[PDB]
Amino acid sequence: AKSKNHTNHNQSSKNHRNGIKGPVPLHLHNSKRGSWLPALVNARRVRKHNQKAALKKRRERIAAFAAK
Amino acid sequence: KNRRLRLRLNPYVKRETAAAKGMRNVANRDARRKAKLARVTKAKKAATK
Amino acid sequence: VKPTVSKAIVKKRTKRFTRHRYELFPQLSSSWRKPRGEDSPVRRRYKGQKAMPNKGYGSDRATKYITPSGFRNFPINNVEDLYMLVMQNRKYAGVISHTVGARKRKAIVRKAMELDVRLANGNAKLRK
Amino acid sequence: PTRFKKCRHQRGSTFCGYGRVGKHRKHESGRGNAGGMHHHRINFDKYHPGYFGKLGMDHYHRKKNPMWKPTINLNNLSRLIAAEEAAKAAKGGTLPVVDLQSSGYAKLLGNGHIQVPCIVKARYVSKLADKKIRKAGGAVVLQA
Amino acid sequence: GVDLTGISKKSRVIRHHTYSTNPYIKLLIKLYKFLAKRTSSGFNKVVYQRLIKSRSNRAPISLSRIAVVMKRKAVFTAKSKAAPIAVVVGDVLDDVRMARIPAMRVCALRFSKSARQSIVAAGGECLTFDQLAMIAPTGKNTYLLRGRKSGRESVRHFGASGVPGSHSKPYATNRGKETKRGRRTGRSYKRKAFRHV
Amino acid sequence: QTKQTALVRVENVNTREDATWYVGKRVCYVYHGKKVKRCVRWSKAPARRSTTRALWGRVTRPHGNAGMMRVKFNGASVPASAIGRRIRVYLYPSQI
Amino acid sequence: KRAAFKQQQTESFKKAVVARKAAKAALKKTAYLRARKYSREYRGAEKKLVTLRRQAASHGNYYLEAKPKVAVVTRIRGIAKVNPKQRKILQLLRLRQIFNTVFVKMNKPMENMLRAVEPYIAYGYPSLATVRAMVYKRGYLKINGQRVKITDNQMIKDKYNNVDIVCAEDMVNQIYTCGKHFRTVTHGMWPFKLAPPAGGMRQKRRHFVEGGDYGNRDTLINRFLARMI
Amino acid sequence: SHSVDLQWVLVRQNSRFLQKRGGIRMSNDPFNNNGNWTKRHCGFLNEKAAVVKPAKGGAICVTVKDGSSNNKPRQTYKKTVHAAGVRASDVSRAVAAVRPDLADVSFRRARRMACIASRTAKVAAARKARSEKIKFSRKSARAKR
RNA sequence: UGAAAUGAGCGGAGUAUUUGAGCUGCGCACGGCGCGCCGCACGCACUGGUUUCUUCUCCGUGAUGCUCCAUGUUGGCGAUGGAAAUGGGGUGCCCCCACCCGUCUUGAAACACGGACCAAGGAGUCAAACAGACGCGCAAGGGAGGAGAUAUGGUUGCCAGUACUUCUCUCGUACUGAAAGGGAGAUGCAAAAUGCAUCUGUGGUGUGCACACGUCAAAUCCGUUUGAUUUGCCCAACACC
RNA sequence: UGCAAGGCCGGAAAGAAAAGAAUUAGAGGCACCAAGUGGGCCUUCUUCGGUAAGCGGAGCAGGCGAUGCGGAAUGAACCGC
RNA sequence: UAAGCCCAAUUAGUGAUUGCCCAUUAUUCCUUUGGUAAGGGCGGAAACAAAUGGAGAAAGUGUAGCCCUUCCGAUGUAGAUGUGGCCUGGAGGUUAGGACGAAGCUUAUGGCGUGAGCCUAAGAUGGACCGGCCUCUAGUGCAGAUCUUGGUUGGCGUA
Ligand SMILES: [K+]
Ligand SMILES: [K+]
Ligand SMILES: [K+]
Ligand SMILES: [Mg+2]
Ligand SMILES: [Mg+2]
Ligand SMILES: [Mg+2]
Ligand SMILES: [Mg+2]
Ligand SMILES: [Mg+2]
Ligand SMILES: [Mg+2]
Ligand SMILES: [Mg+2]
Ligand SMILES: [Mg+2]
Ligand SMILES: [Mg+2]
Ligand SMILES: [Mg+2]
Ligand SMILES: [Mg+2]
Ligand SMILES: [Mg+2]
Ligand SMILES: [Mg+2]
Ligand SMILES: [Mg+2]
Ligand SMILES: [Mg+2]
Ligand SMILES: [Mg+2]
Ligand SMILES: [Mg+2]
Ligand SMILES: [Mg+2]
Ligand SMILES: [Mg+2]
Ligand SMILES: [Mg+2]
Ligand SMILES: [Mg+2]
Ligand SMILES: [Mg+2]
Ligand SMILES: [Mg+2]
Ligand SMILES: [Mg+2]
Ligand SMILES: [Mg+2]
Ligand SMILES: [Mg+2]
Ligand SMILES: [Mg+2]
Ligand SMILES: [Mg+2]
Ligand SMILES: [Mg+2]
Ligand SMILES: [Mg+2]
Ligand SMILES: [Mg+2]
Ligand SMILES: [Mg+2]
Ligand SMILES: [Mg+2]
Ligand SMILES: [Mg+2]
Ligand SMILES: [Mg+2]
Ligand SMILES: [Mg+2]
Ligand SMILES: [Mg+2]
Ligand SMILES: [Mg+2]
Ligand SMILES: [Mg+2]
Ligand SMILES: [Mg+2]
Ligand SMILES: [Mg+2]
Ligand SMILES: [Mg+2]
Ligand SMILES: [Mg+2]
Ligand code: NA
Ligand code: NA
């Protein structure tokens, strides 16, 4: 007793009922893991300094607000 | 088709129907037909000469 | 007491919805059952078959539950039950329970006449 | 209660939600965890990775009692100090004494910032917990 | 007929009544349903929606979390203005990791006994949602807050743990079991810890 | 068939314009029953009592191009035993 | 006699009544003036074109008419057996039901859309009478998601909240002349739901030039729709 | 302590006074002017209430709960009997003194009480005439003390 | 059948106002010839003029009605009766429709299987482990269980219940390593192979309710509301570190 | 002071002109828990084996299955709906 | 002299552009039901006895739906879910009925509900128990399984 081997019938209809969802935007899930390591290492040094600058900047703003 | 609704949506509709009555007046229609043909024919002759 | 006047009762359908082929079997009662057979002509909505009940047959909400007399039927079991219908006596009529006996029915019929409370199954000779 | 189960809703439905085609048969996949590597492999592989195989050294006759070692962090120490003693506790003065092994703990771990300085009696202490409690005015005393 | 393919997929599961059997919850829903429709405030509408929510969707909040976000708002707030009333549609639980807290006015459905003691001992006051409606009928000068749910153990189990990039906990009573094949590179393969999305 | 509307052919009415003249006219089908039942003027005019009965309707619109007319009867539908039988088409309500 | 809260309501309601009547009179005057202005614009525009045609004819020239900017499209087929490409276009045209009708701009992006669904829709170039009849008799607005028949000019003003669209004649003028608010007016309307054409069609399966119905009929669409509105 | 709003939530679905007979929800509440099972008409439940009741003869009695002795049930309800012939608006004004939101139903109930008393005398008189022409085999007479 | 008649329609006034159609001024457009000349079917502006004919135009009633029901005319029948009506029920008849149910199956009215009748019986249950949704209690803690104590050392029974207790046990507040074994705060100062200081504090960044400052738009019964947006803080979350 | 990267501070922003110069019955994203199903079949165009088949096997898309109704006298799938 | 085939029309060289008939389609009117539903009202306005305008007005998922206005959808096997949705035997409550007749049974007994069913009437039936509502509980609903047991039955006054 033989049966049907293969068909793609109704598959495109099934894939479009809940639609084919679009891709995630570029600004989301933009992990740099696995990229070129020498550029990754240098970027980490800059990001560490940027966090320190952000912490200090909030300290100045808090003092400035309390100044008035 | 309704009188109230047409006037409510278009307050100007009374003037439009008054104009329509004038064009369907037999004397107005016949006088206009004579005048329109004479003035168009005169303009056609002048343009071609 | 006369009932409150309402709009005319429509009653979309008078015939009952009866079981498929219940006339051919003494076992089967006429009570409606949804036909779930795969090849059932009633379930498949064939032209000459019985209809199946659905939400479209629902009656007008203004005239729903109203009896032909114009009242609504409220079950009552004793004399004290008549006082629940004193104010709304043009809307509701009392239905004496079947099991209430003849001795107790005399008091209920006597009291309802003085209160002008309509009894759906009360004394026929009274109220003319 | 029986009146809330799906059986009552399925009275008159014949197949009771199992279908006319596939039906409700006895054991269509095998019994229990049968075929974990044959015909049930995908379910085992994606939901229970690591299920099959061996790992590690054996420990015959394990006794959990010699291995008893509950831990408490430095920032949870106020759970064992009475309210009236915590208010009176301050660096440089008299501090409450906490017996860890009588409260069900064996090791002071030392996560977070300590809220009230105190003297902690413990069987074990992490190297960071000992350093932090001493800088905050408390101390650790070893017990057994 | 009208072509309306997939129109049912546009509809959303929106609940209007509560499943709660608590009569005092129903009283609060009755009060704030009135306020959400007779006032213009967006606070009353949000509070009314959260009262209908299930218990799982009203996560509890720690007392330390309230004090931290209050301090982030206390700075950059003028000394003339008073501190807002912290409002949470849920439970407030005490935090033993933070002993010194400022005086705050907190409104919640329920306070734990320790949390109520800690708020009062710091000079604050534990408010009730019917009290809040009388002092802040439109929610003026309030700090609406929500509890955390991303740390729940149910969330940590969601998804398949065997697919690459996944770090959910499997359903297993024995911790030692389910550790050999599929979790170590030595035993056949290891589930990949990272996957680009 | 839909029995709420009936088709009536009238002698000498063989055009749609002819049938339009009868739109609105009262239509009567006359038969008899088995027993003498109530009628109009049962007590006023006892001579009217008879087994004769009448069902009354009206012409709603013409049908086709050959003078056929559509008739709707009062409330109920005309019996199928009236098929092939005489239908009376009166001249009232008059428009002349 | 009367409660205080019921007394303040009376004065506020009395002032609401006075202002409502004033707004009704103000809108009636505004709609009158705009309808007169449009009426003369339409009459003069056709008179200008008649002279232009006469001048070209007298000297052996030709007058090329402006390409129509507005098309009126009605669906003439049911909802059965529609391919996904044709299904989506009719959805974007809001032609989800047979004898549904919309007004569209006859530009290149829309024309290529209409060519793809030609067997399903009969379309052409509407006249001023056709646009007026559809707006006045079959005109509905999308108010709060509801299909509301246009019964007075205040709804048009409140729906569009635009200076240039306050009355029915503003609505007709935007559609007929393809104004800058053509999309705003047409989008704000519910898709027109028309009756079947009295007198029947010819053949819904063939193109109009084949003796059928589904093609572009040019200005013959007005005769088709006159039996439908 | 426990307001009417809380009490109504507790007893709306299950109460001694609620009668759901044949799909109709009525009330035996002696302090209900209507028989409708609503929070407004629940005289036994509200802090203040008033119900129009019949009295001996054609008199109309107004029973009032003023909300001062709710914790003392034998003093909760006070009766004031109006002389026969009282205007229905006067009865409604007495009720409105306690419950202004019951003024309309109290007026209608005051009118119905007067109508019933007149009908009761008319029906009883007709019954007496019928009984006067009938010979009864038995006649019970309650003993006096 | 006027229980709020919104009317070009009802009611008050007025004898006119302004729609076209004819005829017309200036300028500009447009057409023809090649600089400004001619034409202009009568387009735009002056809401041009003209009044020859063609139209009627101007005001007017909120709900102090939250909701439902309740108000004509002319005959026929019905004046209390084995009655007059309307509805329901029963049987026959006419014209139209109308394949036998349940099942497996792509496909059943099937020359596919089970089907003489009726009554009574007849099939997702109980227990254990886990998980998710929802209800409830408490909450960094939750809760037993076994057992004991005494109201009860009492009562045929109610009472095999209810009330009370636990330095225990268990699940969590900490996780990792095969194990030996280790074991998680922030900021600042600084770079000590366990560095110091402080303790009211989201580690940072982007997107992000409410709330607070404004700032626009629309509508207002002029009290406001309802949208958008700036700035601050951003809760819950998501994404990079 | 040039390139690379992460930020900060400002400026400008028909919020996208005009050229036929889009449209939308245009709330996007994120989850959790589960059922049936996993024998298909028929048609339009394309198409492989076979002399062919109401034969076997595929692509795209509709449909029957799961659905009657109005038509082709009659027909699961044709026409209309 | 088609009632056949090809073509072409709509009362016909007259005066302009809809001959006619059939749908579970379209338009529109009425009613139901459900929404990702959209809005209003809900602080009793004032006045008003009977004999001789009325009634209601619940801050509300779901009921006889709190009332009113408005818009849109409604078929469906396998399957999911919801229902102040229906029914049965028992339990904790509450409120009733019965020798002037309970349960059961009988029906051209009608009424109500879209329905599951509920209720009344009659018995020229019966002879002692039992209804409603809230909650709890389970051996809880039958047309078919060559289903089980009992009885009956056409074949048949036949072989
Ligand atoms: K096994
Ligand atoms: K229902
Ligand atoms: K047997
Ligand atoms: Mg095959
Ligand atoms: Mg297969
Ligand atoms: Mg019925
Ligand atoms: Mg089938
Ligand atoms: Mg009986
Ligand atoms: Mg069955
Ligand atoms: Mg099913
Ligand atoms: Mg299932
Ligand atoms: Mg299976
Ligand atoms: Mg193998
Ligand atoms: Mg080994
Ligand atoms: Mg955590
Ligand atoms: Mg045709
Ligand atoms: Mg085709
Ligand atoms: Mg007039
Ligand atoms: Mg020139
Ligand atoms: Mg009437
Ligand atoms: Mg009369
Ligand atoms: Mg036949
Ligand atoms: Mg088979
Ligand atoms: Mg087969
Ligand atoms: Mg079959
Ligand atoms: Mg065969
Ligand atoms: Mg078989
Ligand atoms: Mg215990
Ligand atoms: Mg853990
Ligand atoms: Mg270890
Ligand atoms: Mg849109
Ligand atoms: Mg097969
Ligand atoms: Mg199979
Ligand atoms: Mg509807
Ligand atoms: Mg009053
Ligand atoms: Mg409710
Ligand atoms: Mg359905
Ligand atoms: Mg049992
Ligand atoms: Mg009972
Ligand atoms: Mg009988
Ligand atoms: Mg019978
Ligand atoms: Mg029952
Ligand atoms: Mg059973
Ligand atoms: Mg049986
Ligand atoms: Mg058998
Ligand atoms: Mg025999
Ligand atoms: Na199948
Ligand atoms: Na509705």
The closest of G73, G179, G88, G165 to G126, measured between CA atoms, is G73
Confirm whether any atom of chain K, the nucleic acid strand, is less than 7 Å from CB of C29: yes
Window 37-56 of A, Cβ < 8 Å to E: none
C81 is in an annotated binding site: no
The nucleotides of chain I lying under 7 Å from a protein CB are 6-9, 18-23, 30-32, 39-45, 47, 53-57, 59-64, 68-71, 76-78, 80, 84-85, 87-89, 93-99, 101-106, 108-109, 117-119, 124-126, 129-141, 167-168, 173-174, 178-179, 182-188, 194, 196-206, 209-212, 218-226, 232-241
Cβ neighbours of D79 in E, within 8 Å: 96
Best of C114, C125, C126, C128 to disrupt the H interface (most H CBs within 10 Å) is C114
- The breaks in chain G (C to N more than 2.5 Å) occur after none
Report the DSSP pairing between strands E85-93 and E142-145: parallel
Contact H119 C116 (CB under 8 A): yes
Residues of B (18-37) whose Cβ lies below 8 Å from G: none
Contact G108, G87 (CB under 8 A): no
Chain E residues within an 8 Å CB radius of H5: 27, 30
B5 in G contact zone (CB under 8 Å)? yes
Q: Tell me, letter by letter, the H, E, C secondary structure of chain A.
A: CCCCCCCCCCHHHHHHHCCCCCCCCCCCCCCCCCCCHHHHHHHHHHHHHHHHHHHHHHHHHHHHHHHC
Chains D and B share 3 or more Cβ pairs within 8 Å: no
Q: How far apart are CA E26 and CA G12, in angstroms?
A: 36
G17 HSE (CA, 13 A, CB side): 6
Residue H25, CA distances (Å) to C66, C74, C82, E140, H30 in order: 16, 10, 14, 43, 16
Tokens of A25: 């935007």
Residue E65 vs residues A39, E60, E122, E194: alpha-carbon distances, Å = 38, 11, 15, 31
Q: With an 8 Å Cβ cutoff, are E27 and H5 in contact?
A: yes
Set of chain B residues whose Cβ sits within 8 Å of the Cβ of G29: 11
Q: Cβ of residue A58 near strand I, that is under 7 Å?
A: yes
How far apart are the CA of E32 and the centre of ligand 37, in A? 36
Tokens found for residue G53: 């045609």
Nearest residue on chain G to E4, alpha-carbon basis:
G96
Question: Which of H101, H64, H94, H97 lies closest to H79, judged by CA?
Answer: H64
**How far apart, in whole angstroms, are the C-alpha atoms of residue F40 and residue G12?**
63
Query: How close E120 comes to chain H (CA, Å)?
Result: 24
CB pairs under 8 A between E and G: 15
Q: Which residue is nearest to nucleotide J69 (CA to C1')?
A: C47
Which positions in chain A touch E195 (Cβ < 8 Å)? none
G96 to chain E: which residues are within 8 Å by CB? 2-4
> How far, CA to CA in Å, does G76 sit from each of G84, G186, G203?
18, 20, 10
Kindly compute the dihedral angle of the four CA atoms of residues D113, D114, D115, D119, in this order, to the nearest 10 degrees. Answer: -170
Q: Are D55 and E183 in contact (CB under 8 A)?
A: no
Ligand 4 center to A15 CA (angstroms): 28
Return the sign of the alpha-carbon dihedral for residues C64, C66, C71, C73.
Answer: negative
Technique used by the depositors = cryo-EM
By C1' distance from the Cα of C39, the closest nucleotide is I108
Closest CA relative to residue D124, chosen from D97, D103, D101, D90: D101
Residue F67 CB coordination number (10 Å): 22
Q: Is the CB of C125 under 7 A from strand K?
A: no
CA of G214 to the centre of ligand 21 (A): 61
Chosen for mutation from E3, E5, E11 (greatest number of chain G CBs closer than 10 Å) is E3
CA angle H36, H38, H39 (to 5 degrees): 145
Nearest ligand to the CA atom of H101: 35
How far is it, in rounded angstroms, from Cα G107 to Cα G128?
A: 19
Query: Which residues fall within 8 angstroms of residue E26, CB to CB, at 6 or more apart?
Result: E18, E20, H9
Query: What residues have CB less than 8 Å from A18, skipping those under 6 apart?
Result: E9
Euclidean distance between CA atoms F46 and C34, whole angstroms: 56
Q: Which E-chain residues 5-24 have CB contacts (< 8 A) with chain G?
A: 5
CA distance F63 to F4: 15
The answer to whether C76 and C94 are in contact (CB under 8 A) is yes
Q: Taking the CB of residue H32, how many other CB atoms lie within 10 A of it?
A: 25
The DSSP annotation for chain E comes to -B--TT-TTT------S-----HHHHHHHHHHHHHHHHS--HHHHHHHHHHHS-STTS--EEHHHHHHHHHHHHTTS-SSSPPPEEEEEEEEE--TT-------EEEEEEE-HHHHHHHHHTT-EEE-HHHHHHH-TT-TTEEEE----TT-HHHHH-S-TTSTT--PPP--S-SSSS-STBBSTTSS-B--S----
Best of B2, B4, B6, B10 to mutate (most G CBs within 10 Å, chain G): B10
G74 touches strand J (CB under 7 A): no
- Test mutation, E22, E27, E28, chain H, max H CBs within 10 A: E27
Out of E6, E76, E197, closest to residue A24 by CB: E197
CB contacts of B9 in chain G (<8 Å) are: 136, 150, 152-153, 167-168
Q: How far is the CA of D21 from the centre of ligand 5 (A)?
A: 14
Would strands G146-149 and G192-193 be described as parallel, antiparallel, or unpaired? unpaired
With an 8 Å Cβ cutoff, is H125 touching chain C? no
Whether A contacts E, i.e. 3 or more CB pairs less than 8 A apart, is yes
- Report the candidate in G190, G217, G188 with the shortest Cα–Cα distance to residue G201: G217
Contact G169 B8 (CB under 8 A): no
**For residue E14, how many other CB atoms are within 10 A of its CB?**
7
- The whole-angstrom separation of Cα E35 and Cα C20 is 55
Beta bridge partners of H20: H25
**Phi, psi dihedrals of residue A25, rounded to the nearest 5°:** -65, 160
What would the DSSP string read from start to end of G100-148?
A: EEEEEE-SHHHHHHHHHTGGGEEEE---HHHHHHHHHHH-EEEETTEEE
For chain C, the DSSP string reads: -PPPP-PPP--S--S----TT-TT-TTS-SS------TT-TTTTT-TTSPP---GGGPPPSSSTT--TTS-EEEEE-SGGGGGGGSTTTTTEEEEE-TTS-HHHHHHHHHHHHHHT--BTTS-SSTT-
Euclidean distance between CA atoms G197 and A37, whole angstroms = 73
| Ligand 3 centroid, distance to C28 Cα (angstroms) | 19
Strand partners, F53: F31
Bridge partners for G140 per DSSP:
G149
Q: For residue A19, give every residue at least 6 positions away whose Cβ sits within 8 Å of its Cβ, in sequence order, or none.
A: none
B3, closest nucleotide (Cα–C1')? I8
Q: How many angstroms separate the CA atoms of B39 and D52, rounded?
A: 106
| Residue reference for tokens 């089908």 | F29
* Helix, strand and coil percent figures for chain G, each rounded to 5: 55, 15, 30
Distance E151 CA to ligand 15 centre (A): 4
Enter the DSSP assignment of G162.
B
- Structural tokens at position G214: 């589904």
d(CA H36, CA H142): 38
CA-to-CA dists, residue G178 to D57, G103, G224, angstroms: 84, 10, 22
Cα–Cα distances (Å) from F18 to F5, F63, F71, H124, in that order, read: 20, 11, 15, 72
Q: In this structure, which amino acid lies at residue F76?
A: A
Angle of helix G84-92 relative to helix G108-116, nearest 10 degrees, comes to 140
Query: Which 8-state DSSP code applies to residue H33?
Result: S
Instruction: Please report residues of G whose CB lies closer than 8 A to that of B8.
Output: 151-153
Element holding H127 (H helix, E strand): helix H103-131
In terms of Cα–Cα distance, which of H141, H32, H52, H36 is closest to H95? H52
Ligand 24 centre distance from Cα of residue G199 (Å):
50
Token pair 């859309």 is at which residue? G113
Strands D97-99 and D119-122: parallel
Alpha carbon distance B40, G51 (integer Å): 10
Q: Do C36 and D20 touch (CB under 8 A)?
A: no
